[PDB]
Amino acid sequence: TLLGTALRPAATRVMLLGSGELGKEVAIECQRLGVEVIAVDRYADAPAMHVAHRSHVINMLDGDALRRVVELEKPHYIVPEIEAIATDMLIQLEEEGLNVVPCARATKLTMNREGIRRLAAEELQLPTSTYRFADSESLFREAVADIGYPCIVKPVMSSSGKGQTFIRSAEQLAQAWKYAQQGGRAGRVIVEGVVKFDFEITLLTVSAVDGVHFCAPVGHRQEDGDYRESWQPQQMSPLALERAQEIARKVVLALGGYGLFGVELFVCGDEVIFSEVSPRPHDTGMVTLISQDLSEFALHVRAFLGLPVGGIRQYGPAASAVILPQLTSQNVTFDNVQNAVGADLQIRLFGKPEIDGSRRLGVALATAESVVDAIERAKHAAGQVKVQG
Amino acid sequence: TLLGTALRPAATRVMLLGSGELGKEVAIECQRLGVEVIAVDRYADAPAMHVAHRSHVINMLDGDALRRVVELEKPHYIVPEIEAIATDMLIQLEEEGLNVVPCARATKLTMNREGIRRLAAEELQLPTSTYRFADSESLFREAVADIGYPCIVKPVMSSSGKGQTFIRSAEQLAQAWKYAQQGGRAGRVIVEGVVKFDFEITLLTVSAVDGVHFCAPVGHRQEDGDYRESWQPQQMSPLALERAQEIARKVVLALGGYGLFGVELFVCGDEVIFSEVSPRPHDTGMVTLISQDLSEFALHVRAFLGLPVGGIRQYGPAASAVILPQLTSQNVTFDNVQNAVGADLQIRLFGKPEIDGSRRLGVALATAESVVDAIERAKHAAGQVKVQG
Ligand SMILES: Nc1ncnc2c1ncn2[C@@H]1O[C@H](COP(=O)(O)OP(=O)(O)NP(=O)(O)O)[C@@H](O)[C@H]1O
Ligand SMILES: Nc1ncnc2c1ncn2[C@@H]1O[C@H](COP(=O)(O)OP(=O)(O)NP(=O)(O)O)[C@@H](O)[C@H]1O
Ligand SMILES: NCC(=O)N[C@@H]1O[C@H](COP(=O)([O-])[O-])[C@@H](O)[C@H]1O
Ligand SMILES: NCC(=O)N[C@@H]1O[C@H](COP(=O)([O-])[O-])[C@@H](O)[C@H]1O
Ligand SMILES: [Mg+2]
Ligand SMILES: [Mg+2]
Ligand SMILES: [Mg+2]
Ligand SMILES: [Mg+2]
Ligand code: NA
Ligand code: NA
Structure with missing residues (x-):
């Protein structure tokens, strides 16, 4: 594997299709390797655009528009970050020789529940x-x-x-x-x-040149269609973990291609049930920003570039808690930040240009000697942030 | 601490004066908080510019040039990244109300080993x-x-x-x-x-709202005026450590202002001698990109933003090893990258536009059961990277 120098003739070019908070970290990880980053989205000044070499705003659901930007920038890798993309054009492009992460079929199958559900079940x-x-x-x-x-x-x-x-x-x-x-x-x-599970998890699974690797199980709590907190590791029986791994491995291999996948699972004791899968970094995995040597973002990058993962280090109990305010503003501010970070506590503020209702504008992250304590420290910190607009 | 949203009218703006590999990480840290970053350097496409919101190429030794850029961007924080800047202009600017990190005097004083040596001694x-x-x-x-x-x-x-x-x-x-x-x-x-020391250390010392905190001592190897390898934590005596910390506190507190400082000391037995100090993140400190919860760059930003540090977690033996080729090219590529990454091992490639002689183009980072092992892992990895022109 060879990498060029961003902005130079032999630059290795990555195009993100979707520039939200997830892509922002993918962008940073690309940039850390001197990888040239083109951030595309449906609106300007999207998070990943702040940290990219160049940005474009197009209708990502318009296959012609996609073709156009791709021909324009000539990326080596097309890294979809959201579901709402013209997957049929990605398949075309892939055939035309472009590398779609993880693969174009993976993207098509997961953007429509019917495809992935019928495949899995x-x-x-x-x-x-x-x-x-x-x-x-x-x-x-x-x-x-x-x-x-x-x-x-x-x-x-x-x-x-x-x-x-x-x-x-x-x-x-x-x-x-x-x-x-x-x-x-x-x-x-x-x-x-409705599956009445004991708890639900996200099994962040990396399919790479050196095989399938698993991050420790990330537990998460959802409310009103939004993840609220996540933590790692989520405790599971030995049998449950092995079952989860089995399912995850089968899924990523079936979808194909290198990358990190967020395999959503429901756990009932020792029994595991498949829910859905992100063929890319998952929101709940943002906890890995504090909990691992290689974040899910770093792992996605590593894997897609064709490099070996080797292994993943987990630093102990950790959690993330969303900063999800509700207001209408195009000039959002965050106060009381001094009460939101400290020992074993950090935050991330996305740089999203505006809000008109509820929107995930940041995330708090914490570590502790238990997930219970980490969860509380993260929620508390997210709470301390005084969002104004 | 109130932070705005980058690119929005109430954005919090940080201007880097120097955009090399150190500032790149500082930039990444600012971005993570939605802070607007303006990267200034004397050449185009400097590392930090890749990840900044915008950039400026100017002669930073030119005070009139510095004032212009400052006044044009109206930054909330001026963050020196290199020694060679017009410190007088900083002073003046500070006098005019500008926030210089950690303080303008600190920048001047350290530029001059006259001023700093006298002060310390x-x-x-x-x-x-x-x-x-x-x-x-x-x-x-x-x-x-x-x-x-x-x-x-x-x-x-x-x-x-x-x-x-x-x-x-x-x-x-x-x-x-x-x-x-x-x-x-x-x-x-x-x-x-000259001083015949057992070994040399960099004591990365952060001065913030909650006082002064220290990272574990970083040991390093210098060669031909360039650090080659760095490691953490450097083994020393509690007494030596205690003394080192006291010297560091004294110095930082005397320099004034919030920020991360790189205190260079010589260790001979239980004795410690102050050599010099950088009022900013230090190269050897690059090991902290893999060895701690907050890298020296994250600490720098946390501190200057008026936020509390609370504590610094050290993940065990770790090391950095520089990627320091010597050639002339404007289109550098890096091959065999797959043999430079793996479990507990990562690399950074800076994005420098060209090279003409010896230049630091990246760094390998590793963790291991022992300091010695970490250094070897990092050295080996840096050595695997094939730098082409
Ligand atoms: N069949 C089901 N039984 C029980 N709970 C479910 C079921 N389907 C969804 N849920 C719950 O609803 C949450 C969101 O469901 P999900 O299918 O992931 O929606 P989504 O719109 O695809 N969200 P996202 O994860 O952002 O793509 C899940 O994490 C569960 O907490
Ligand atoms: N009195 C001294 N005794 C022994 N070693 C010394 C002495 N002064 C400098 N050194 C060595 O010189 C290295 C670099 O010299 P230094 O004093 O830091 O000058 P410099 O030109 O400012 N380099 P830099 O560290 O990049 O600012 C140190 O890290 C020591 O290994
Ligand atoms: N579970 C999906 C998910 O977390 N997606 C993340 O949110 C962005 C959109 O947020 P927005 O609606 O605030 O613009 C996406 O771009 C992705 O990063
Ligand atoms: N020891 C000081 C040090 O590491 N400085 C770092 O190197 C840059 C210059 O690199 P360049 O000479 O290759 O442009 C500086 O901008 C700083 O990031
Ligand atoms: Mg879904
Ligand atoms: Mg889901
Ligand atoms: Mg020195
Ligand atoms: Mg110096
Ligand atoms: Na692919
Ligand atoms: Na200051």
């Missing part, structure tokens, strides 16, 4: 919640009837819980369906039976 | 090398006589050994007095009477 025979898809209200209604209550309805093309409803009674059916319509390419939906 | 009353001050070949001649063999000859405006001479013999004096003029402005000198 039907082709890989992995355990998942029960599910049905529906593309009309009536079909949706039949689906619910067959699935039972409670059940969760989600659009097949969504993230961070947009257009999703936890359905407890037929009473919600109409609202649920409309709402699932508002969320979505606005479309088809998935109706899943 | 006379004023602070700390142990240093022997010395005096010549201002002529005759003034030079007489002094070196007062010091004796062997001894050191340094321009009071020298760095990296720029203009220095190790004198064991009178014959040299023909040379030395000349060389002392080769370098610096191109002059006046300082003659030191």
